[PDB]
Ligand binder design. Structure first.
Ligand SMILES: CC(=O)N[C@@H]1[C@@H](O)[C@H](O)[C@@H](CO)O[C@H]1O
Ligand SMILES: CC(=O)N[C@@H]1[C@@H](O)[C@H](O)[C@@H](CO)O[C@H]1O
Ligand SMILES: CC(=O)N[C@@H]1[C@@H](O)[C@H](O)[C@@H](CO)O[C@H]1O
Ligand SMILES: CC(=O)N[C@@H]1[C@@H](O)[C@H](O)[C@@H](CO)O[C@H]1O
Ligand SMILES: CC(=O)N[C@@H]1[C@@H](O)[C@H](O)[C@@H](CO)O[C@H]1O
Ligand SMILES: CCCCCCCCCCCC
Ligand SMILES: CCCCCCCCCCCC
Ligand SMILES: CCCCCCCCCCCC
Ligand SMILES: CCCCCCCCCCCC
Ligand SMILES: CCCCCCCCCCCC
Ligand SMILES: CCCCCCCCCC
Ligand SMILES: CCCCCCCCCC
Ligand SMILES: CCCCCCCCCC
Ligand SMILES: CCCCCCCCCC
Ligand SMILES: CCCCCCCCCC
Ligand SMILES: CCCCCCCCCC
Ligand SMILES: CCCCCCCCCC
Ligand SMILES: CCCCCCCCCC
Ligand SMILES: CCCCCCCCCC
Ligand SMILES: O=c1[nH]oc2c1CCNC2
Ligand SMILES: O=c1[nH]oc2c1CCNC2
Ligand SMILES: O=c1[nH]oc2c1CCNC2
Ligand SMILES: O=c1[nH]oc2c1CCNC2
Ligand SMILES: O=c1[nH]oc2c1CCNC2
Ligand SMILES: CCCCCCCC
Ligand SMILES: CCCCCCCC
Ligand SMILES: CCCCCCCC
Ligand SMILES: CCCCCCCC
Ligand SMILES: CCCCCCCC
Ligand SMILES: CCCCCC
Ligand SMILES: CCCCCC
Ligand SMILES: CCCCCC
Ligand SMILES: CCCCCC
Ligand SMILES: CCCCCC
Ligand SMILES: CCCCCC
Ligand SMILES: CCCCCC
Ligand SMILES: CCCCCC
Ligand SMILES: CCCCCC
Ligand SMILES: CCCCCC
Ligand SMILES: [Cl-]
Lengths: 334, 334, 334, 334, 334
């Protein structure tokens, strides 16, 4: 029996190696397999990875006439001591178990141990959509011991920045992923003490040109089209009025569609500001012709009893104001 | 063996400490980690937290030459007595178990015990949307013993208002969170008796300006635009009619979009009242020109065989009525 | 040991109390905690409640110098006999298990037993939407023994109509709940025999005014607006034609939006009938002016080589027909 | 002890009754309780039913002074032999377990056994939507032994067509259910051999009138309305042009709404063909007036330097072509 | 007892057959039952299949007077050694367990073993939608040993390309499936070594004509309709202006609907390019008439104090440019 070579019943495996003395160091390596999904409304992401641990335990040393190691499955875990790692700020996770539990244990003749498992985790990530669609987001995954303070267990990256590997075909449907790196920091709990915590960081970005073409282009085109009325004869009322009222209707339908396609985030964003400023511009264009028509009718009635100056001034004033607004807007939001 | 220092087999752990005598006090502390989501249609919220208990049991005292404590995992729970807490008015919950069960047990040499676990819970919360989007909501989470009356188990906050801690980056996508505090109250069951119950309370609010700009602005702009027709010559029927009919169409499309974006709550809200009053105003504007045109045609036919008074009165009457309505509406709903 | 006071190993708990003789009566009480959700497409509802049982078993009597009872958790259930209740016509259910199983057992010194558990269940409910939104629905939850006929187990409400309690803040987002009561009836299975079955009944209703304002109002307003054209001069073709064609477009957009907001039920309802009758009315209004214009052009051409009678008759005929239709419709559907 | 009357430890229950000899027959009966849901996109359905088995095993015979049978729960299943049935072409299933496992076992004194359980299953069903909404679908549920060939286990319906029962109130929200019946057929696996397979069949249909009124009616009405322009004076260009352009807009909005309400199936259906033919008809109507106006302007200019024949021919040609198309279409698709 | 014929307790089943010597070969066969679903947003697919293994183990040989084999259920798996296969790049999987675990074991008298199970798996698949809807996708499923390198376990297809079978009625709602085949490749892990990996490949395609008719047809028809204005008299301003403004509105509504029906992929696709080029064409058509009207008004005013050349040139220039664009576009994207 392979389990009789290790004196399982001759040791108490309820206690850590080296109990009573200096803390036992544990090394960690991580391989990211894929990103599964992201949720903007719930502000969280899902990931699948391999987790590996390294430490030494003299109690597991066995005699040998060569240098071959023994491999075990997950059934041996319950008979020995292993680190109790958990993910911080996580919402749900589980360990794969098809066709059997995805757990492996390797023991060297001198007592070195390797412990590996395959897991999926969902973690929180606070997001800010003030500068949408030009916004940038940063995420992290956290690992910590649940019951062991730094005085008993010392947690670190096995090989520094080289302990993190990522799959070559990791990608997201609506985001670009960049700048993976790792960090460490100490955490304090008033109940027990200080703990070591490991981090994995990365950054997310959007495709700008797609959003530009979908949103900014039609509004600008509609604003430019609203200016055509300034060059039509003021005596053609049945041409002048329905032009403006149909332009307002088109702008309203565009805004409603754009709202219907965006993530349901209930606070002001930059695109909304741009759209509503364009709406206000379209509205003022109709007000202008209203004034011009009333003034012309009053003058004709008074005379009874050429280009109007308002149109001549508007032809210059409206484009200049729109250009100034664009310049300020793109200086603020880059 | 660490478990041989505690006389597990020398005691009956089916019975509470102090059985037959005064009730055993139990203290509680809670740390909120994050809010996960909220559902307005189902009226419930989800939360993740740490739960901690404190009590004393002489049966667990062990001799020691120092003052060091022993730490245990979840496997020891089934061999001893622990409080049976549960969440009241909850829909679902579970305990995290990756990479192993998130449970810890600490025993002092004098028999003091600390019991901590990490859990996610979904709880009900009745909501009222009468004053939407200006409404405010209050929520609470409840904790109670399942089988032990106050005569056997006394439940309380360990440190009063200081027993509650919240994460510094707790936030919701579409809500603002404020005013966390704790309370206690007694509950009565006719089957068994009286029980102690603990509460955790907080308040929710919306972003007003976003809803204002999305909903109230376009309706007001359309109502103001409908008034332009009063200043156009009454002899331009092909300009007067299509203006009004297109304004009605635009208002209808706006209302349909606004309905399509709101949570599916099937009873009257304030925003609906505002929108339909604006719709009625637009409708009356078309009726006005209908009357004016019929009267003018009748007068011309009678004569055959200047500004009309109706327009002159409407130019003043319509804005005043709209202002009065706004004043009453914003006095009622603040 | 508390379990040594009951002679567990001295009895066979695979057989019911009183085996071989008259059936053992069992009493039931239910407390409804909340309604969780409802699904109109799948026609089912979800509920959370406490379930309690009462019976007597002499085998569990224990000697005592006082009149105190013993309390047990769910671990004792597997060592004794308990009733095997199940929910009929249910889709899914489960028992809460945080922080431990929500089960309690109380034994009196004379052998009386109380057995309580907390459960969530989803049950079917056939619905008929013919009279939507004026429809009414009735639901029920059913409880029955799985393996025991009335000759072995007699099931009844412990205290008649007083065995049912409901929470004071039970509510649904889109429904009103009323008229809770209980009933019993016998059921027959050809495989085994007759069984007792318990019922819990309640009724559901909608908010009428919300649906009225959302649906019936705009259609009526559009039908009334379509009548304006009868009072405009027949010589203004460019005003008469686009009015009607835009009214048809507005009505079509309204119908499409109303369809987009309703539950996806694929058979005819009353609201659809009302909407399509209004659509037909709008369509006939355009046909009327088409005829009037053709007749006027023919007469002018013949003469070449005042109010038309059709308009004068239509002004009276259309409103009367619409009023008659409304009267019949609201007499049929109340 | 009831389990001591059956010599459990005196027999090997790892082997089928009659091992080494002729195959043991097993009879099956099924009672359908309800249909839970259907998914057109994923093409599958869900069902809840009772499953019952019948066979004889001499090893379970026990002496008795009467003819009473013994009833067992699911805990005895693991101690004896039972058939290993499974559902073929299924996606997921489970056995109900509230308040305990829904399993029953009945043993006669001569060794006859009845084995019943309550289960929910989701199964695949390939669907074809070519003739939607006039299409018809056929479904089936399949049952088979997992490890036993016909040489060891013979599976059949206990009572032929009478072994299938259905609930009197089984219904689906958007479908009609009819023609339940059962069949059997042999299946071959190259790995092991031949197996018996049982079938349960039924048929599904839609409500035709609802779809007719929702889809076909508005398109026909719009096509008929487009013909009005043929009877208006050709000199009223501002009435003729906007009529046609608004009719095209209305038709486009109707088609978009109809697409938005239908199941997301990405291949051509009959309703789409009808809608796009109507669209083409509307488009040709505008082209006609374009030609008429250009020809009239050319003739007036040439003369400078009555009803047009095109309108007279169109008034007859368009309705005849539409009627012919309808006749062919409804002859093809019935 | 059947398990006493195999000397279970006389062997250590924690170690592979042939331990210490050459690697043990294992053969694999797969039968695909159905495809369950696909997700374009999450880029993954689901499948159900049977998995079978073949190998030889002398430790399981038993004496026999004939050549009959013994069949076992899943309860024997835990008492012997079996290969630890797992799926690479998978998101979730599970083994069916109704009415019991779907596992079978067959042992020949000489020690040959067959091991079969039924499983459902969801796997990742990176997709590229640049050429949508004309795009093509390739997918694969991967199988590998979790703890055994090629030096200990040799994995291969049992019968080459004949080891893969597919159901005759496998289909997807919105895709066509073709070209199933298998491949093998070696993989390297720096932690342990080299591993054998098996592949299953297939290809996906769309229905082109459906997308053509739904998307490309209406845009082309609207572009062609916008050209009608070039043939109308330039003196009919109230006919010329609203035509163009309504054509722009119709095009915008079409684009919004098309966007509302497509999978939410946030980057540029070919269909978007086609739609926005058509939009630009419609916009230029309105600009043309604006210029023509201004020039005519200026000339009339100057004279005060026939066909215009712009229309004559446009009638030829616009269709030629559109044809050239179509030719280039369909040469690029085939
Ligand atoms: C252990 C270690 O070297 N960590 C570094 C980290 O401090 C640095 O920020 C990153 C590049 O930004 O590269 C890595
Ligand atoms: C135990 C205790 O001091 N509780 C108080 C509570 O009564 C009070 O309402 C709250 C502030 O409102 O502060 C805390
Ligand atoms: C046990 C009993 O009294 N049940 C009654 C029931 O028969 C009656 O229908 C209901 C009121 O409708 O009140 C309760
Ligand atoms: C066992 C048996 O009698 N089966 C028949 C089946 O063959 C027949 O098709 C059906 C009616 O169609 O009635 C049943
Ligand atoms: C083991 C074997 O013969 N595999 C082949 C594979 O190499 C080839 O690509 C495919 C057809 O393309 O047919 C199969
Ligand atoms: C809530 C933070 C300030 C947001 C400012 C938005 C201003 C937009 C006004 C648009 C007017 C048309
Ligand atoms: C149901 C509680 C009273 C709601 C009152 C709403 C009144 C709105 C009328 C709108 C008329 C256009
Ligand atoms: C299917 C049961 C009869 C439904 C009758 C509906 C009649 C509505 C006709 C509407 C015509 C515009
Ligand atoms: C893909 C199978 C043939 C489908 C034929 C559809 C023809 C519809 C043409 C509609 C033209 C407006
Ligand atoms: C992002 C890769 C290049 C995409 C090029 C799209 C060009 C489309 C322009 C449409 C102008 C109306
Ligand atoms: C904001 C004013 C709305 C009414 C303006 C009507 C036009 C006035 C022209 C003098
Ligand atoms: C008619 C004079 C020129 C009109 C266009 C002016 C554009 C000004 C942009 C700064
Ligand atoms: C509510 C009345 C609808 C018909 C009114 C038509 C206009 C009348 C002008 C005198
Ligand atoms: C249902 C008839 C459709 C064509 C009617 C065109 C108007 C005719 C006026 C005499
Ligand atoms: C012009 C005569 C009165 C027009 C309105 C008549 C309404 C009739 C409703 C019964
Ligand atoms: C003006 C002559 C009759 C117009 C309608 C003809 C309908 C033909 C349908 C076959
Ligand atoms: C398909 C042709 C589109 C341009 C036609 C413009 C009308 C021509 C009238 C002679
Ligand atoms: C000369 C006609 C000018 C028409 C107005 C153009 C304003 C927008 C220019 C892009
Ligand atoms: C009026 C001269 C012909 C107009 C149509 C020309 C089409 C050119 C396509 C290359
Ligand atoms: O309850 C606790 N007191 O400290 C810790 C926990 C859980 C997470 N590890 C540190
Ligand atoms: O069934 C009961 N009778 O009292 C209680 C319960 C459950 C919740 N604790 C108090
Ligand atoms: O299979 C059965 N034969 O009778 C019954 C069942 C289940 C539900 N209880 C009565
Ligand atoms: O793997 C198999 N070889 O034959 C069968 C199976 C499963 C389903 N029963 C027949
Ligand atoms: O952790 C590992 N080191 O090598 C492997 C694993 C898992 C998958 N098998 C090969
Ligand atoms: C009218 C558009 C101006 C854009 C300027 C952008 C400056 C970075
Ligand atoms: C016309 C808007 C009036 C708003 C008044 C608000 C008073 C608090
Ligand atoms: C025109 C509406 C008539 C409503 C009558 C209602 C009778 C109960
Ligand atoms: C114009 C509709 C004709 C319908 C004919 C139907 C023949 C079965
Ligand atoms: C105007 C459409 C031209 C299509 C050409 C296609 C060449 C393969
Ligand atoms: C829209 C503003 C017009 C101002 C006329 C004096
Ligand atoms: C805003 C334009 C004013 C023009 C004054 C003549
Ligand atoms: C819309 C009301 C008009 C009243 C004319 C007297
Ligand atoms: C409602 C306006 C009435 C005007 C009377 C002259
Ligand atoms: C819409 C019907 C008109 C009838 C003219 C005689
Ligand atoms: C339907 C109206 C007919 C009028 C006859 C003069
Ligand atoms: C729409 C086709 C018109 C043909 C004129 C000759
Ligand atoms: C398609 C109609 C042609 C008419 C010829 C005079
Ligand atoms: C739309 C471009 C018009 C150019 C006139 C010179
Ligand atoms: C783009 C058309 C230009 C025409 C020049 C006469
Ligand atoms: Cl006009």
């Amino acid at each position: 029996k392979s389990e009789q070579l290790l004196r399982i019943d001759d040791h108490d495996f309820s206690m850590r190696p080296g109990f009573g003395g200096p803390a036992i160091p544990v090394g960690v390596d991580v391989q990211v397999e894929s990103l599964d999904s992201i949720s903007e409304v719930d502000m969280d992401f899902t990931m699948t990875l391999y987790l590996r641990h390294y430490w030494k335990d003299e109690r597991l040393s066995f005699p040998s006439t060569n240098n071959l190691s023994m491999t075990f499955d997950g059934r041996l875990v319950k008979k020995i001591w292993v680190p109790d790692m958990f993910f911080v700020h996580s919402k749900r996770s589980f360990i794969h178990d098809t066709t059997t539990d995805n757990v492996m244990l390797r023991v060297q003749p001198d007592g070195k141990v390797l412990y590996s498992l395959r897991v999926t985790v969902t973690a929180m990530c606070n997001m800010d959509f003030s500068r949408f669609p030009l916004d940038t987001q940063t995420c992290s995954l956290e690992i910590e011991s649940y019951a062991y303070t730094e005085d008993d267990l010392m947690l670190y990256w096995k090989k520094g920045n080289d302990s993190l590997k990522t799959d070559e075909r990791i990608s997201l449907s609506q985001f670009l992923i960049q700048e993976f790196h790792t960090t460490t920091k100490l955490a304090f709990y008033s109940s027990t003490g200080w703990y070591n915590r490991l981090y994995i960081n990365f950054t997310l970005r959007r495709h700008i040109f797609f959003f530009l073409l979908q949103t900014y282009f039609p509004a600008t085109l509609m604003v430019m089209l609203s200016w055509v009325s300034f060059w039509i004869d003021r005596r053609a009322v049945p041409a002048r009025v329905p032009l403006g009222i149909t332009t307002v209707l088109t702008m309203s339908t565009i805004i409603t569609g754009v709202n219907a396609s965006m993530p349901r985030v209930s606070y002001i964003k930059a695109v909304d500001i741009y759209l509503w400023v364009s709406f206000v511009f379209v509205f003022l264009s109709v007000l202008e012709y209203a004034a011009v028509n009333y003034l012309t009718t009053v003058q004709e009635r008074k005379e009874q009893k050429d280009t109007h100056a308002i149109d001549k001034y508007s032809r210059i004033i409206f484009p200049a104001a729109y250009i100034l607004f664009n310049l300020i807007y793109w200086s603020i939001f880059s």
